[PDB]
Amino acid sequence: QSQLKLLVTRGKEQGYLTYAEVNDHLPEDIVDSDQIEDIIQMINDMGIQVMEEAPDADDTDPVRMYMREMGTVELLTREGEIDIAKRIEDGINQVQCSVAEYPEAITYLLEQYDRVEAE
Amino acid sequence: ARVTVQDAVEKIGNRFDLVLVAARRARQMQVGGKDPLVPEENDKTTVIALREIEEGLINNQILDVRERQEQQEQEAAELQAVTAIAEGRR
Amino acid sequence: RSPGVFFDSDKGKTHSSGKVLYNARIIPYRGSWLDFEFDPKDNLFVRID
Amino acid sequence: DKIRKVLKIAKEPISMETPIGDDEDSHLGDFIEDTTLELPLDSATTESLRAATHDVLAGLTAREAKVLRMRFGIDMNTDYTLEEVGKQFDVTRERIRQIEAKALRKLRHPSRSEVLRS
Amino acid sequence: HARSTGSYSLVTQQPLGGKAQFGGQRFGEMEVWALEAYGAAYTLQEMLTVKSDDVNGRTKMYKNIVDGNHQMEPGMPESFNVLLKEIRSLGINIELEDE
Amino acid sequence: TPEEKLLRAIFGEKASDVKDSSLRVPNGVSGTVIDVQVFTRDGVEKDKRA
Amino acid sequence: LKAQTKTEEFDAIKIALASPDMIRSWSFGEVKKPETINYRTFKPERDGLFCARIFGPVKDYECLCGKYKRLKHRGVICEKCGVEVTQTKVRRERMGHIELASPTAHIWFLKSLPSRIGLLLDMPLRDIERVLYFESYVVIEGGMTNLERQQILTEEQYLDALEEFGDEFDAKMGAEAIQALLKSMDLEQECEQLREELNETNSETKRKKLTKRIKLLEAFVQSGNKPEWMILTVLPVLPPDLRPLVPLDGGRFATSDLNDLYRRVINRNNRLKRLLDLAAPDIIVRNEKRMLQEAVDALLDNGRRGRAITGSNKRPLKSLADMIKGGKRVDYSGRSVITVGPYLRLHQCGLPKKMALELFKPFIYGKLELRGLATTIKAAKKMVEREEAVVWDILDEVIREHPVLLNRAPTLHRLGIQAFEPVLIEGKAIQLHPLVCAAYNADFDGDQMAVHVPLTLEAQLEARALMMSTNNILSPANGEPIIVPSQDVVLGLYYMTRDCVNAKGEGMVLTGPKEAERLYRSGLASLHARVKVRITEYEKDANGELVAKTSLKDTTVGRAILWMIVPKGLPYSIVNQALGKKAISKMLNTCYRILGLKPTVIFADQIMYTGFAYAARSGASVGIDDMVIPEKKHEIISEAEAEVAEIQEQFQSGLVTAGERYNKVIDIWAAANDRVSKAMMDNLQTETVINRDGQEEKQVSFNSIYMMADSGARGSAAQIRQLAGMRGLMAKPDGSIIETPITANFREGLNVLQYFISTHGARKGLADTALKTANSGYLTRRLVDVAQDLVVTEDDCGTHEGIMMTPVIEGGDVKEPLRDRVLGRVTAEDVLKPGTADILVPRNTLLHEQWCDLLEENSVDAVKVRSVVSCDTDFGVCAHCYGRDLARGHIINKGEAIGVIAAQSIGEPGTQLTMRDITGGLPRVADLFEARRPKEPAILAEISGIVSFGKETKGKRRLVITPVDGSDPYEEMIPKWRQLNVFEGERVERGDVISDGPEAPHDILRLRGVHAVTRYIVNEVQDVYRLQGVKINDKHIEVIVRQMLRKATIVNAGSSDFLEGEQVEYSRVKIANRELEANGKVGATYSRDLLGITKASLATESFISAASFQETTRVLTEAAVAGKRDELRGLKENVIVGRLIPAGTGYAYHQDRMRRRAAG
């Protein structure tokens, strides 16, 4: 509606391709080096039909998008940290115990020790 | 044809082909079998070919035919070697 | 261009039809630009830097 | 001096795509000349040198042309010494050096290699 | 200024100097228009390859000159082979097939 | 190159492990030297003429 | 049984996507380390950006370590380090690759105007396609329940949909998600179903996107490229030498930005690989993937989104794309300041000794070693480096008939570069023939020209047979001579006429040459008297030959001696009986048309020599008393100021309209200016009194200044009017005119005020000149870019149709005839004759046979002539249909280059065009060529019918006219604004005016006709040259308009898909092969379409030629999508590749190769 009607009605055809005009008639955060190429590509070259390919296509930043998912705090306290650390030690313990159940791990350690003492 | 070179184009239409054939003949002269037809008179091979073309001799068909005879002379006269080689690999 | 403030023309065709569209502008010596311009609909806009 | 060598490692350093004279348009990497290539003149002289030497060894004898050729190693890649040539020519060492010296005596009049020196 | 043969840049094998000789003259679009207008195909041919930025071409043709043979024996200029490698350097592939 | 080794062998080697990069007045111009000057490094053996 | 696997000759090049395995084929190893060079040893690291094993060795034939040195092992790799020891240029050609972990999207096929990865997948670009691959909103990859196939889900929606179903609609997110999306896509089945759906009961409410996508999908599927290659998983590496880090002067290396890019992408990719083996937090890994995306996108093409910085430089980094998106130096060249060389011939130029010495270096070497002198090549070097006398003589041998071509800076037309025969001159400046000094538009203010030495044999012949100055007698633009004598020489020959009464005159008669003895021996004057002599004339007719004609004519001393210069033929005397002004060129022209080349050249040299000599003998100067001011000056000024004073007094007491008294008082001063101008001219012209026999008589002033003005030689009426008369109305920065013109003049003193007023004119003059000078070339580039592809071919085709040529007559209400626009034109067919017979069918109008078109009286002022506009040719231009207008007198040689010569000739006089219902000037020409609709376009009647109102303002609306007759009506739209021209009930014809305003070329071509629209363009573009007074043939305009109407639009039903607008090339060649192929009903009828130069140049077959001028990033990408191939007939694209040009000396080569490429 707004963007389409303003762009089409105004640009007829702006004569000298007055760029510094409709770029301010656009919403969102301005002063970007991204939307710039999407306007200098439509105005000329493939005239007429390009102005119909523009709207149909119109129908951003690494760090800012990193802080976005980082926004999910889930912060912890001394109780929280100790809790998580406890689960870690519990997991590691169960794994090591599961290894202890495996007799071939013991006999292999024995064999490799005899290899160590044999230099 | 020190200054046109225009009197040569009417002998073979389209100045371009004129350049081709003249460069062809001049190429024959500068390197390989020289033997000019029109007297040199201290002129480069560039112009000598143009002089010949103007004279009426040495054209496109002329050089091509003489090349055919040249091939029939190098090949047919020296076949005793090629034929002897033909029996090399049966 | 000398610092201070001046009202610019922009007279003539700027959007077809052709109708004035005056605008004021303040030029600092060490700071940010402060412009004020009209539109065909006679609204007032401001440009910071 | 160690500090001097230290400052020779600093910086990225500069990139070729840096503007310099601000012409239309200048580039630092466009003034950098190539040196690994040889002058066409030098290459021509090298070719003419090969032909010259190949034509000079013609005015020599087989038991002298091959000697100078094999000793200094030319047109045969791997160069040999007095022993490897003295064995292939019966008489060893000094004898093959004698002829090697005599050949050098032959080249004191021709001007080809003389001017090729410079 | 005058230049027969001198140095060349590392990036593009094009004539340049100022250390012993003088960097060769620049042809350009305005000139290739004229050469095309005349129809001097061979003049533009050499002026774009061996006479400019053809690695082996310049040497081969130079030897042909000193021997009084002229001719040319041209080849693909590096100012296009580099382009091939640059385009090939991307996800896009370009190949020069025979017939 | 082998040919060059032979060539120097016939006229004397003297193949010094040094090259050449002397400042020469460019071909074409010609004149008279009016003033010489030398800026030595701080910690380098000063020259006689310097 | 060919099938060769080497680097031989190629006929075409192909552009397309590259598979990961395709990238592997170029891989001579894998870069795995961000390391470049060693910090101490300065030696290439193991697997870095500058590896020796992967790419190439540093030195020529020695490996990295040093186990192998010489040519002993050139084919064998090293044992300690796998380094193939070949050349160092190998390092310049070796590729290499980096194999990333997680997939990465190509920046080009992602965000480049249309979303190539999006449009192919039918999905929003910077909206949806961004949020799903930047790890934010998961996308679906085909579902058989509840969910569609390409919808976007959030993490909450994902788990919810996963909980409802799951384990049967799995769909990931990010790069690999889009990969599986493109891979799962079936181009074939969709190509069928889309054709089915997008054709069922749908009007013009859908057809747009339908035909668009189906054509795009069909192109992609037929291209051969698999959509999997759209996003790369393996990124190739550019050779090290194309991005080296070479040590400058005393340390301080110099590297390319690409090394920084590759180093960054390597780092980020390695961390990404390491993270996919250690602990794998989703946020960390996904971020590193986005960072890898950043690095890759920055390496391929920066653009575009913030621009990655680093490298200490505040400026961005030159990515790969930036190195191929947007002056060919050459050896054996030079340049120097030019100087006049009067003693030279016309095919010769002054080339400095030392300059020519350095130029023909290799030639001098070869010739020296050939003769003797120098024992070897280096001997010749040491011999020429030490200029040893004899060497110079050898130089005189090498430059004998070896032509050298000269060139000026601003090369507007073909005559910018002309070849000459080198002549040694003891100096450091280059001398030039003053005759061809006009073709270069060169003066001796200090301008400098460049020289090039044709090395190739055929290059020398090209310079001698084409680029030679003697071959360029006539201008390519207009048939008139270009080497025509200028200022100095013309004044000389003007002084060799100028019949003065008495003064050592008398009618002492002799016989031509004998009169010369009379002149040197004084007694008689030179400009008398007249006097009679015996002239032996020569004429020919019918059977050619020569016929003598001795007579006794009354000429002068100058005319008699000058007659000796005149060649064998010519009417004689009458060419000398005139004077020296404009007929000075006419004589040269007629001499050319009736004699030929050589005699026309020597005649030029003779008239130049004679001109200079007698000009020097004359001694015409410019004293202060040469510019005599009129006595009526102060009188006229007082009278003018009297009238304006009365007008001001009237304005004081009202009466006259004070609002526009400014205009009428301007007319007063303007009138007064013409009064002073007329007075000064009538005075300075005649004057004199002499004293013939019994005294009392009048001729024309011998006042130097007038002599210069009445004989070309840079001297116009306006300038003289400012010298002695007065500078008229002066311009004001507001654009208005001052009501107080410069009453004084340069002969008199100038007040500070009027000079401070004139400074505005000088300032704006130089300023406007600086603009139009660059604007002219700005137009020329577009002209060339659109026209430099058509060349006269296929000899001479048939066809008879062609624009009916008629003398451009403004004489309807102003009287102005021009009937020379028909000459060297090939006749259509026997254009009648008030009786019978006469003109043949294909007979080209000769220069003498166009004078025969005056023996048929003023009745015959209309002849149908074959033009380049018509012509049933295919991809070229018929020789007959063109003409002959060149430096050559005959028809254009087959396989020329009409396009470039046409464009040059048009954009040449652009330098002298003043930019502004009449626009006028260069901008007017641009608007005409671009085919732009006026600010108030008129309207025409499409079909002849009965004019009637169609509901008075019932819309909408706005008036409506409906011309209905015979069958079917039409409803045009009149927007109230602007009146009309036809009342109701009246009938109109097919293309009648119903707006009486500016006409639109589109409507004319679409309705009126092609001949009409072309006639309009040519007759409207010339009208802006008439005012500027620049002669230019209509042929060239017709040439650009030819390909200006290149494409058309078909409207019916045929093998071509209807809506597609295609060029009449394929159209005609396909309609000719369908009426006699299977059926004429399998094809439709087309309709010519008017498109501007830019719009026309935009479309072209070759993708390389397009990659030249227009935006490379677009054309290269879209050409990459569809397996396109250049093959390969264009001029431009065959220039950058560095091969023979398909025109001129080439053509034959291309023709042979073209027919050669028919076997397969």
Ligand SMILES: Nc1nc2c(ncn2[C@@H]2O[C@H](COP(=O)(O)OP(=O)(O)O)[C@@H](OP(=O)(O)OP(=O)(O)O)[C@H]2O)c(=O)[nH]1
């Ligand atoms: N048109 C023409 N001239 C030829 C031709 N061949 C030789 N000439 C003329 O020979 C004259 C000088 O040539 P030279 O080099 O001195 O003697 P050369 O003929 O033995 O080589 C020139 O005269 P020039 O042109 O009359 O001098 P100018 O008129 O330029 O002042 C040159 O044009 C030819 O084939 N055609």
Ligand SMILES: [Zn+2]
């Ligand atoms: Zn090694």
Ligand SMILES: [Zn+2]
């Ligand atoms: Zn035709």
